Design a protein around this nucleic acid. Structure first.
Lengths: 192, 49, 41, 23, 265, 254, 154, 152
RNA sequence: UUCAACCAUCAAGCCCUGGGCUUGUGUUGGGGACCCGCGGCUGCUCGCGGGCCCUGAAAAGCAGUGGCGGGCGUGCCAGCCG
């Protein structure tokens, strides 16, 4: 059974999100950011849903690397209520790629247990090892798009699941919208 | 281009068992649930409209 | 049927006025004998 | 005044009952 | 626009108002606003602008001591309350009847009856420009269905993370605040709506017709210069009228079209 | 009982009381240390520091393995970071005492043999890659082993640093850690011949070379100036490859 | 902890030579305690009364709806003396009362009072005067049904 | 059998056609539904009529949601009698009530070019408007010499 | 089966050194008299926008206009334009 208060709350959330998206589209207007999908409004408008589909952030606690351009900044501004993003540092990038790094070959998820996969799949771009992949991601090279599409989205963990009274609690609470800058690294340390 | 072989976590676990600090046991993915019966609460039975 | 429609309306009214936790879990007891539970000593 | 304040402060006509005079 | 026709209209409107009130007498003649009416060929704006524009007058309005002014600032309200209580002149201290920040406004005046009580308890509302975009939602249609008591923008920000209100207020100096508040209280208001009509309160009936003439003329120059698109080619008609009187035309155009593109064969 | 009290506080809605009681829980996800203190157990299990040095093979293999694992509910990320910190402190002791003797690159990992106080210590470190956690191992009881072994290694590191007269724990730079210093984030301060094989050389490690084993081996066998690529981390002697002061360069590209 | 912090601030105010009213503000809390709430109802200071449905002995609250009706106080019977105890930081509260709230919650209090008046009191106006109980057991009801159908058939 | 009509008022903002249909479809099948709205702005007048297939379902829903406190509103839910239900109560039901910009239409129609004949109509009309205003200003004691409008 | 909070608590751009200007669109619904401006309506009147009051976040048919796409010509759009 569904409550009338839930119906009204969903309508008001949809109206507020429509107003926000219309304001962004009317107003219009290269670094590396790490973007993590967090829980937000259950009903997503088609344009933020399509942007999340393109950024492969369909599942909660998924993390991706994004190169900051005008179009990417516009898309991140569109999907701020469902994501938390910031500037990752060298330790965060290195630990994410070495500990939770998976490669997309033939559409399947295979971990980066060797330099052989990187040499066979990105060797045409000059990337022959995991450290070359880290270099491309961190310095945002010409082949950053190919490196990011090779990298599978990262599945981060929920530390609250280790404590029984707060087992069901989500780790990241929504409400702190906008860029977290260097404070995304605390979340990366906690969830990786 | 070296391809590392084996699994070092499995190696440490096998070393633990072989040296005898613990015995070899299998993972239990599903535990048997308690046999219970579902019933309706008295307030929800006595609700009338 | 009219009885089914009425039952649906009664269930909706019960959910609106009391909630959805309408059921309780009850142990199955194979014996009629009750034993004192073993507690920490 | 406010209708909300009137609703909160509305009572009956029966006079109040006190155990004792208070400071 | 010839000034003699306008100043003749000033005597005529004042005489008609006085003889209509004669049918307290002085109190009835007083507190009767004088409205300058703009009629344009097109809509003056493409949307409802809810922040009034200020036109500075040689003879300021709201100079009476009984006018109560409510000032809405950003957080905290304590700093501005202390500024009013200590470092303001006595006339402004008597005129300002309430200082409240946006957080307390959203907390204590969410109710429609609370908004109507706040509307009735004051005459002129001033609002800091840092929070004036949030005031339509905080004050509702109570303050914005009628253009009379819409919050007038004032600048209190010190001209150049999340600011802590207790630690810092980010405010311009107090004499600058005093000058800005006095200027905004004395200024006349223009309201932009998608309409051919715009009404501006330029004076009262108890004023002198020359002061009406000067105020109307400066409102004419500043309004056609700043807020009217396509300048005088959009200007159709200018009227002067009271709340109950008829409209006296002080300027009527000769062409009813914006340009030659409207005329088609 | 404390967890029951926390559950009662959360069920009654006392968030401040729940937080205050949770501060007494000493959770590994908050402290980076094991939930229960095993200091009295360490002395009981190892009557002598010689016995501790003889069990250091298993201790070092377990901790160097777990320093490269992803965060789990059994082994949280802060406790993994503490594993890495203890391994780095042990490596720094080996560097400053030149106790490292042999190394071997096998198909399973890198074997290291050192000599601490006349005891041969041999342990295996995985290559820096993604490690697979399979279902055929009991990961939670492995985590209990990890907790015991870090409790042992903390006291072993303290005794070694105090014996060679250095302050323990060493000064650690969090800014350099987030910039990726790894072994270079530690500053060793005083309290209150095969060792000089690479003494006169200047080394440059390229991007595709294993930075942590190469730096550990070179600094243990006498190198004082090792630079590397900027992506390999903070703390290089020289970031620029074209520097004329560098004598040797490690490359592994075709 | 909040009371300790407030007393520390008041102690600093006394030390610097100010009244404790200069540093502390008038509090607004939920009133509780059975004797205190009964006194507030008798003095007609309570705006809303919530009475637990499971008070044992029942004589502690059996007069209280009639007292509220005599004094013209809006009352409501609510499930959970433990639930009221969660409000008042106790294991159990027999009754709670609202006398006055802050200005930002005066509208919410008035709307809650009107909602109670229109949705509880008017609905229980006629049912509160009836007798309870008198229900038969399952087998007794089935025996009575069999008896009445037997009598109707015969 | 007999259909049921329920009048619901004190609707909070957001509790509109789709929300009403989805909520009361849990109670029973809804055949018709209409929220009363202003034609000038499209805004709801906080009242609606719901026409259920079954009168007992409508009656149960009305007693369930009568005096319901929702978003600061105490909802009104009553069953109207079949004698007092209007035959044209549900005209325009089961469809969107569009927000038509009459003000934008007015702006655009004053922005449209017009031809010279209807410009003659407009100008001539406004001279008798000026004439009526002037003969009203005769009693005013005010004289305005209105300049002659040049003819296109 | 969570009725919370979340706009800009200032940014960007002009003048080029004065502290001023521009943009950043954001309003519960009704009722009562009544002065108007402009569009149609032969005209009454009807719309658009102003002026003066009243109101618990109040409520008992009267629903009114041209289309793009989408769904099955259409009392269909949790999609838009005019």
């Amino acid at each position: 059974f569904k409550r009338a208060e839930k119906y009204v709350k969903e309508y008001r959330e949809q109206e507020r999100e429509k107003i926000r998206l219309a304001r962004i589209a009317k107003q219009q207007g290269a670094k590396l950011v790490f973007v993590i999908r967090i829980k937000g409004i259950n009903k997503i408008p088609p344009k933020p849903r399509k942007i999340l589909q393109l950024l492969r952030l369909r599942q909660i606690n998924n993390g991706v690397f994004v190169k900051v351009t005008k179009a990417t900044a516009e898309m991140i501004k569109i999907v701020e209520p469902w994501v938390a993003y910031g500037y990752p540092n060298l330790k965060s990038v290195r630990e994410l790629i070495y500990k939770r790094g998976y490669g997309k070959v033939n559409g399947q998820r295979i971990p980066l247990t060797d330099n052989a996969i990187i040499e066979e799949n990105l060797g045409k771009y000059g990337i022959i090892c995991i450290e070359d992949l880290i270099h491309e991601i961190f310095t945002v090279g010409p082949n950053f798009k190919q490196a990011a599409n090779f990298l599978w989205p990262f599945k981060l963990s929920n530390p609250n699941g280790g404590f029984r009274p707060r087992k069901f609690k989500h780790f990241i609470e929504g409400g702190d919208l906008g860029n977290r800058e260097e404070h995304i690294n605390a979340l990366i340390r906690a969830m990786n | 281009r070296l391809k590392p072989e084996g699994n070092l976590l499995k190696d440490r676990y096998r070393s633990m068992i072989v040296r005898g600090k613990l015995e070899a046991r299998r993972k239990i993915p599903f535990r048997k649930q308690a046999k219970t019966k579902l019933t309706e609460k008295w307030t929800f039975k006595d609700f009338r409209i | 049927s009219k009885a089914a429609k009425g039952a649906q309306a009664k269930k909706a009214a019960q959910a609106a006025l009391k909630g959805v936790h309408s059921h309780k879990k009850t142990k199955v007891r194979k014996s009629t004998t009750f034993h004192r539970p073993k507690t920490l000593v | 005044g406010l209708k909300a304040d009137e609703i909160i402060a509305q009572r009956s006509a029966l006079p109040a009952v006190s155990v004792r005079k208070r400071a | 626009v010839d000034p003699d026709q306008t100043l003749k209209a000033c005597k005529a409107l004042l005489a008609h108002i006085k003889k209509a009130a004669a049918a307290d007498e002085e109190s009835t003649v007083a507190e009767t606003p004088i409205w300058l009416t703009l009629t344009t060929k097109k809509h003056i704006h493409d949307s409802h602008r809810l922040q009034p524009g200020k036109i500075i007058l040689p003879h300021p309005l709201n100079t009476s001591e009984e006018i109560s002014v409510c000032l809405i600032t950003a957080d905290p309200q304590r700093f501005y309350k202390n500024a009013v209580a200590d470092e303001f002149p006595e006339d402004l201290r008597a005129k300002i009847g309430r200082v409240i920040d946006i957080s307390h406004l959203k907390a204590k005046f969410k109710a429609y009856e609370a908004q109507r009580k706040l509307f009735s308890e004051h005459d002129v509302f001033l609002a800091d420009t840092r929070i004036i975009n949030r005031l339509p939602k905080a004050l509702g249609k109570t303050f914005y269905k009628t253009t009379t008591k819409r919050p007038i923008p004032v600048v209190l920000m010190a001209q150049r993370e999340k600011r802590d209100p207790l630690e810092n207020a980010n405010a311009r100096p107090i004499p600058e605040i005093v000058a800005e508040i006095r200027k905004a209280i004395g200024a006349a208001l223009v309201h932009l709506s998608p309409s051919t009509n715009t009404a501006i309160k330029v004076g009262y009936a108890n004023w002198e017709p020359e002061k009406l003439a000067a105020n109307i003329e400066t409102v004419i120059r500043e309004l056609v210069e700043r807020f009217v698109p396509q300048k005088w080619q959009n200007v159709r008609n200018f009227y002067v009228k009271g709340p109950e009187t008829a409209a006296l035309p002080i300027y009527q155009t000769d062409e009813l079209w914006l340009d030659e593109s409207k005329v088609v064969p | 009982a404390l967890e029951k009290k926390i559950s009662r506080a959360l069920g009654r809605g006392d968030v401040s009381n729940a937080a205050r009681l949770e501060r007494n829980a000493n959770l590994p996800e908050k402290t980076g240390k094991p939930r229960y203190t095993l200091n009295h157990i360490i002395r009981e299990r190892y009557p002598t520091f010689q016995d501790a040095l003889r069990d250091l093979d298993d201790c070092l293999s377990m901790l160097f393995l777990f320093a490269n694992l992803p965060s789990t509910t059994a082994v949280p990320a802060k406790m993994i970071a503490r594993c890495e910190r203890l391994c780095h402190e042990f490596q720094h002791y080996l560097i400053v005492t030149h106790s490292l003797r042999k190394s071997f690159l096998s198909i399973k990992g890198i074997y290291y043999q050192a000599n601490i106080q006349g005891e041969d210590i041999l342990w295996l470190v995985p290559y820096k890659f993604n490690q697979r956690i399979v279902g055929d191992v009991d990961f939670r009881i492995m985590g209990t082993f990890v907790e015991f072994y870090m409790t042992l290694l903390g006291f072993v590191n303290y005794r070694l640093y105090t014996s060679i007269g250095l302050k323990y724990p060493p000064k650690f730079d969090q800014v350099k850690d987030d910039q990726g210093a790894e072994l270079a984030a530690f500053s060793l301060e005083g309290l209150n011949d095969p060792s000089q094989l690479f003494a006169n050389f200047t080394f440059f490690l390229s991007r595709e070379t294993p930075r942590q084993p190469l730096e550990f081996i070179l600094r243990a066998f006498g190198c004082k100036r090792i630079g590397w690529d900027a992506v390999l981390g903070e703390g290089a002697f020289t970031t620029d490859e074209s520097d004329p002061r560098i004598t040797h360069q490690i490359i592994d590209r075709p | 902890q909040e009371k300790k912090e407030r007393l520390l601030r008041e102690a600093t105010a006394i030390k610097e030579g100010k009244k404790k009213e200069d540093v502390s503000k008038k509090p607004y809390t939920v009133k509780y305690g059975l004797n205190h709430v009964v006194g507030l109802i008798e003095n007609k200071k309570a705006s809303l009364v919530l009475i637990a449905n499971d008070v044992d002995p029942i004589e502690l609250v059996v007069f209280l709806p009639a007292l509220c009706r005599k004094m013209g106080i809006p009352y409501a019977i609510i499930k959970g003396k433990a639930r009221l105890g969660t409000l008042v930081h106790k294991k159990t509260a027999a009754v709670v009362a609202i006398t006055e709230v802050r200005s930002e919650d005066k509208n919410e209090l008035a709307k809650l009072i009107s909602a109670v008046k229109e949705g509880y009191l008017e609905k229980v106006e006629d049912t509160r005067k009836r007798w309870g109980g008198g229900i038969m057991g399952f087998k007794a009801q089935k025996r009575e049904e069999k008896r009445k159908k037997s009598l109707e058939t015969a | 059998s007999q259909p049921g009509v329920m009048y619901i008022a004190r609707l909070p903002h957001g509790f509109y056609e789709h929300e009403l249909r989805g909520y009361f479809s849990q109670f029973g099948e809804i055949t018709r539904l209409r929220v009363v709205r202003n034609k000038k702005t499209g805004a709801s007048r906080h009242r609606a009529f719901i026409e259920f297939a079954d009168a007992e379902v409508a009656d149960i829903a009305a007693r369930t949601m009568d005096k319901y406190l929702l978003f600061g509103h105490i909802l009104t839910c009553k069953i109207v009698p079949p004698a007092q239900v209007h035959p044209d109560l549900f005209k325009g039901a089961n469809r969107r009530f569009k927000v038509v910009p009459w003000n934008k239409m007015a702006g655009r129609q004053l922005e449209r070019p017009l031809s010279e004949s209807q410009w003659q109509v407009k100008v001539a009309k406004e001279e008798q408007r000026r004439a009526a205003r002037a003969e009203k200003l005769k009693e005013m004691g005010y004289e305005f010499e209105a300049p002659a409008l040049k003819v296109p």
